[PDB]
Amino acid sequence: RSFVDAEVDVTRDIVSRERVWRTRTTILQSTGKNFSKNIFAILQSVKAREEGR
């Protein structure tokens, strides 16, 4: 709508001042522990069993 579309610059101004720390990405993350090294080793052990080795 022509009256809606004219005011987008105002909202862009507001959003430039806002700061959000918890987002869709950070909500999923641990505070400090890395799982990749440990879990990939576990998966390697399972993979070895699935391949019968």
Partner: protein, 149 residues
């Protein structure tokens, strides 16, 4: 197995009545999953812990993952896999008392298992289903590690 108990604890108070010794301090922790109470004396000099620290505590009957039941003598030279490899602080001591809300009419709902690590005391107070491997006058290991979160 031989894991008599195991849980995640978070330190709620260090030596609440004030520090009685320099290298030893009380940890008044409460667990998160089994909801256990815990009083533990740690050598705060070699293994410093702060308030609000979370640690994995694993009171074990033996250090060999195959559960082959040690004989209580000290010998550092050993190639056998040991739980101590993945733990930071390890103690050893006897259970010297088990105490619950026993009544003449029914058994205790809650048990407090006391452990003495060669002089440093502990008391693990919970409910009477967790503290079952505990039996007075038996060796146990404390195997605890601070959580990097």
């Amino acid at each position: 197995a031989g894991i008599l108990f195991e849980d995640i604890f978070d330190v709620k108070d260090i030596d609440p009545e004030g520090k009685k010794f320099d290298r030893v301090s009380r940890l008044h922790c409460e667990s998160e999953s089994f909801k256990m109470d815990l009083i533990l004396d740690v050598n705060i000099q070699i293994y410093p812990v702060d308030l609000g620290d979370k640690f994995r505590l694993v009171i074990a009957s033996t250090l060999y993952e195959d559960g082959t039941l040690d004989d209580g003598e000290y010998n550092p030279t050993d190639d056998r896999p040991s739980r101590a490899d993945q733990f930071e602080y390890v103690m050893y001591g006897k259970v010297y008392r088990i105490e619950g809300d026993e009544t003449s009419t029914e058994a205790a709902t809650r048990l407090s298992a006391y452990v003495s690590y060669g002089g440093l005391l502990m008391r693990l107070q919970g409910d009477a289903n967790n503290l079952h491997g505990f039996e007075v006058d038996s060796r146990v290991y404390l195997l605890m590690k601070k959580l990097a979160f």
